[PDB]
Structures are given as structure tokens and as C-alpha cells.
Structure 1
Amino acid sequence: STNLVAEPFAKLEQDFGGSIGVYAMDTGSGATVSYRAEERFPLCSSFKGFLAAAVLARSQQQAGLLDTPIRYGKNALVPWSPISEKYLTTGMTVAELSAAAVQYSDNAAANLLLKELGGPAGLTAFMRSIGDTTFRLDRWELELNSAIPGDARDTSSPRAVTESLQKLTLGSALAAPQRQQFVDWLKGNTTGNHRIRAAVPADWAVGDKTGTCGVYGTANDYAVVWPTGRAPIVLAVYTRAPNKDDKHSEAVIAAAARLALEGL
């Protein structure tokens, strides 16, 4: 990938202080916008969207997987697990765990689903099977958030994120019912209102998955966006920064999303 009118991104990046990674594709025309699209960024919680997709893929071979109740214990409840916390006394079904992971970034729910899939290596294997050779998940929540500069653990690239997202939501990687369920989960996300969603015209439908590592200014969002009467746009906006204490910026993510969309 390349971009011969990259200066707007370059200036936004310089003002932010860190690194911005953008890839956006118009699935109707094939046009793309890129900026550090081939460079590795920490996934943070954005792996949870692909995790739910991997669950749906398995459910195509395992009848009633999604309906399976999980009666998890208190010591599954790592921090930032609001749904799993709320429902501890009842347990939750695999489907509910998947929805909570996507729509609230629920940590405990992600760990429980990772265990069902064979851990970070199992999710990574799923991603290889749809043709993503960049994605790697190595660790569990919360250790995967360390976001250390240059660490390839728990990273992917904006372009591979977008390409996989397109395969899973719009392409053929998931069966049509599973594909619709994944799209619906993304559309019901509650964590992304200040990121890509803040850049999209109010009348376009959006599904998204956010990520927030909590360190090194590292945060991200990927989304499928449905313009008026048009084929959908798929995009990914990732950030990081060189100092552990650097704050992430939702406004930067929104602004880079807007530059991508305006570029398309």
C-alpha cells in the first residue's frame, strides 16, 4: 500500500505525538486509503471482534455451541468485565459471552471464549485459516495490553485487520447466518461512540470494535460503515505512542477516520 496525498495524516500524527495506522477500503470501487497500514500495532481489546467471529465459525460445525451455558467462577472476573460481573450468579451462554466481548469489551468473557477456542494460539490459527498471515494473539487479558514499543506479541496491521473484517462481515469466511450475527453484534457496540462513529454521517449504519490498552497512548477501532445506497466501507484506525505514560486520544482516532472517509 501507498498514499500520495499522505500529508494530512502526517500532520495529524505529528500533532498527536505518536503513531497512527489507517486502512480504509470502499468495497464497491476498490479504492483504499492507507497510512502505516502495513505497520504493526497492538490489538488491545479489538481482538475480541475476531474472537467472536471465531466462535461463530466453530458454531457452524458444533450445533448448539452458541446456546451452551457457562457457569464461570468469581475468579474469572478480571477487571473491566461489566457484563460477566453483572451475570456472575446466573452464568452466561457462549453467545452472550461473545456479545459482551464485542459490545462492552468484556475481559472475563473474552478469556472464557479464548479457553473454548484453545487460547490465543487457537484464535491465531483461526485467523491464519481465513488468510490473515499478520494477526497474532499471544497472551490473555489483561497481559496482552502491555503495548511495549516494538513487541510483536498481540499485534496486527491496520490493513490485515480491515481485510479480515471484510472477509468475515461481507465475504464468504462465515456462513450467511453466522455472518449476519457478527454484523449485528458489531452494530450493537456501545464502546465506540467517540471513535470511528464520531466521523461517520449520522445517517450511515455502523458496526465497530474498539481497543484500549491503557498504556503507551495505544487505542484503536475498526468498523464496517454503510453509506447511503452504496456498497459498504471497511476501515481500521490504530494508534500508539512512544512513552508508557502517553495518553491515548479518541479524538485522534475520530480525526484519522474522517481523513480516511474524506479520502475515499
Structure 2
Amino acid sequence: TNLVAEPFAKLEQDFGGSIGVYAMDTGSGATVSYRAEERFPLCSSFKGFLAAAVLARSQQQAGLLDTPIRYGKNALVPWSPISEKYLTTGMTVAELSAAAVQYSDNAAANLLLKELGGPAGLTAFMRSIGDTTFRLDRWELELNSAIPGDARDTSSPRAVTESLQKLTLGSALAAPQRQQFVDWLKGNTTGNHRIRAAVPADWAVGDKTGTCGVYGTANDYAVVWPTGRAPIVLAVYTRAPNKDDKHSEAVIAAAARLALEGL
């Protein structure tokens, strides 16, 4: 819990919806929590964990990452800029994972989900590193419905942070695989106005965003490297109760700030 929750409550009330935060200092063990136990839509942030499910297989399947995929045009659901660009060449499993992570590429996420046996398969992976909260049920783009109280395609900020720590900094992935996942996260292009905007620009960050396009539901999670110190892992999710509600990158940044300053 949190005995100085007031800063977050005010931010949430001003926003009009739900804020969800869970931050961990790996070095000290300190944590900041606000609706950290409550379910929020993953939207696109599942793609980070997806690439990690991929990097995990690649430890048993050699050359999985270099495997080209010659996808067709009807793989190209909206918001697939990298896939769209590379339609004519195809793309490797690695490049798909990269584009999944750093551009939120929709088609590339679906192509990887297929290689792993769909949402249930990604969900199996996360159960296998100790996440009993995460569940992916659907593909892009239906998984973005963000319907109030729908448990499909949801996790909790703390289980997202705890899983992210396992895959980037602990033992769930082999050291190189682990380095590749952190490197993919560090090259993200979509998170500049969210958690990154709350960090001092001297700290290395890798993050993955999600944006459902409805119900003011948007999110981001991150590993952040302070000067001289163990890294911080955090997740900041949002939703709102009207379909019409606009999400807010500012609130995600602000809530991340409050977590970082809490720590």
C-alpha cells in the first residue's frame, strides 16, 4: 500500500479516471504503489513481454531470431509502420520483435503471437516466470476494447513491473537474450512524452508504451538507470470510464514523477 497516497489521489481526481502505479528501486527494495493491485488494459504494452517470450524460445530454437517471415498484405492491420515499410522484403523474427517493441507495430505483434501459439501462448510464457496476473486473450486490434471491468487482455501495474524486472535484470532470460530485451526497450521511439519525460535526461531508459485508443486508457513501463545506482523498474497505467475519454500522456509522466520522487 501507500501511506502518502494523497499526491496520486489528487492527480487521479484531476484526470477523471483511474491511475495505476507500481515502482521498485532494485537496490534498496523500496516501492511506491497506487492501484498497483488493480487490473488495467495492456493495450500495446503486451508487445514488450511478447518480444521476451520470443527471446525465451530462441534459447531452445537456434536461428529462430534470424528466421525470415514472408508475410502478406493482409497481415497489415492499422498502425503497422515497419511491417508496411518492409512488406516487399519480409522481415526476420528479430526485426519483428524489434518493431513490435520500438514502434508498437501491430502486424508484427500478430505475426509473433502466431509463432508462439496466440494470446494463450504468450499467457503461458508469463505464467512460467511467475506472473499469475497477466492474461492476453485477443489479438491486435480487438484487444484494445478497454471495456470497464473486462478482465480480457489485462494485467496489474505490479505484476507488469515484477515481470519486467525478471526479464530485464534477473534470471528469466539467458544473459544475451536478456541484454537484447533491454536493448530493444532502450531503443523505443514511442515513449518520449511518458515515463521518459519524468526521468532526468542523464539516465538511460528503456520503456514500452500501450495506447488503446478509447476509454482514456494508455500506459507505459520502464527500466530506468540512475547515476551510480541499481535500476528502477516502474509501470504507470491509466483508464477512464467513458469510451469518449481522451487518454493523457501528461498524467502518465506526472504519475511516474510522483513515483520517482517517492522513491
- TM-score, normalized by the shorter chain, greater than 0.5: yes
Give 1:223 deviation, angstroms: 0.1
Question: Residue 150 of structure 2 aligns to a residue in which SS?
Answer: coil
- The alpha-carbon deviation at position 44 of structure 1 amounts to 0.1
What whole-Å deviation, never above 9, does each CA across 1:145-187 have from its counterpart, x for those lacking one?
0000000000000000000000000000000000000000000
Alpha-carbon distance between aligned partners in 2 of 1:76 and 1:205, rounded to the nearest angstrom: 34
SS in 2 for 1:184: helix
Matched ranges for 1:31-46 at <5 A: 31-46=30-45
CA distance in 2, matches of 1:191, 1:120: 23
Query: Aligned residue for 1:215?
Result: 214
**Structure 1 residue 244: Cα displacement:** 0.0
> Quick check: 1:120 aligned with 2:119?
yes
Q: Residue 185 of structure 1 aligns with which residue?
A: 184
Root-mean-square deviation (CA, aligned residues, Å) is 0.1
Please state how far the C-alpha of 1:4 moved relative to its aligned partner.
Answer: 0.1
Cα offsets for 1:93-137 (capped at 9, x unmatched): 000000000000000000000000000000000000000000000
1 CA distance for matches of 2:229 and 2:127?
30
Structure 2: runs of 5 or more not aligned: none
- Secondary structure in structure 2 of the residue aligned to 1:224: strand
Q: Distance in 1 between matches of 2:85 and 2:158?
A: 36
Q: What SS does the aligned partner of 2:122 have?
A: helix
Q: CA offset at residue 189 of structure 1?
A: 0.1
Q: CA deviation at 1:263?
A: 0.1
1:54 aligned to 2:53?
A: yes
Identity %: 100
CA–CA distance in 2 between the matches of 1:106 and 1:87? Answer: 12
Deviation at 1:18, TM superposition (A): 0.1
Name the CA distance, whole Å, in 2 between partners of 1:229 and 1:74: 48
Quote the residue 1:83 is aligned against.
Answer: 82
SS in 1 for 2:260: helix
Distance 1:169 1:177 in 2: 10
Q: For the residues of structure 2 that align with 1:174 and 1:260, how far apart are their CA atoms?
A: 27
The secondary structure found in structure 1 opposite 2:236 is strand
Q: Please say if 1:142 is aligned against 2:138.
A: no
C-alpha distance in structure 1 between counterparts of 2:192 and 2:62, whole Å: 34
Aligned mates of 1:251, 1:185 — CA distance in 2: 24
Deviation at 1:143, TM superposition (A): 0.2
Residues of 2 paired with 1:62 and 1:126: CA distance? 15
Report the Cα distance in structure 2 between the residues aligned to 1:41 and 1:156, rounded to whole angstroms: 6
Tell me the TM-score normalized by structure 1: 1.00
1:8-34 CA-to-partner distances (Å, cap 9, x unmatched) read: 000000000000000000000000000
Match of 1:180, SS? helix
For structure 1, the residue ranges without an aligned partner over 5 or more in a row are none
**Counterparts of 1:199 and 1:43, CA distance in 2:** 21
Distance 2:11 2:17 in 1: 10
What is the match of residue 167 of structure 1?
166
Which consecutive segments of 4 or more residues in structure 1 shift more than 6 A? none
> 1:167-225 deviations in whole A, cap 9, x for unaligned?
00000000000000000000000000000000000100000000000000000000000
Distance across 2 between alignment mates of 1:63 and 1:42? 33
CA distance in 1, matches of 2:255, 2:186: 21
1:5 offset after TM fit, Å? 0.1
Report deviation, 1:38.
0.1
d(CA) in 1 for partners of 2:228, 2:45: 28
Q: Distance in 2 between matches of 1:157 and 1:258?
A: 19
Q: How many residues are paired up?
A: 263
Offset at residue 58 of structure 1 (A): 0.2
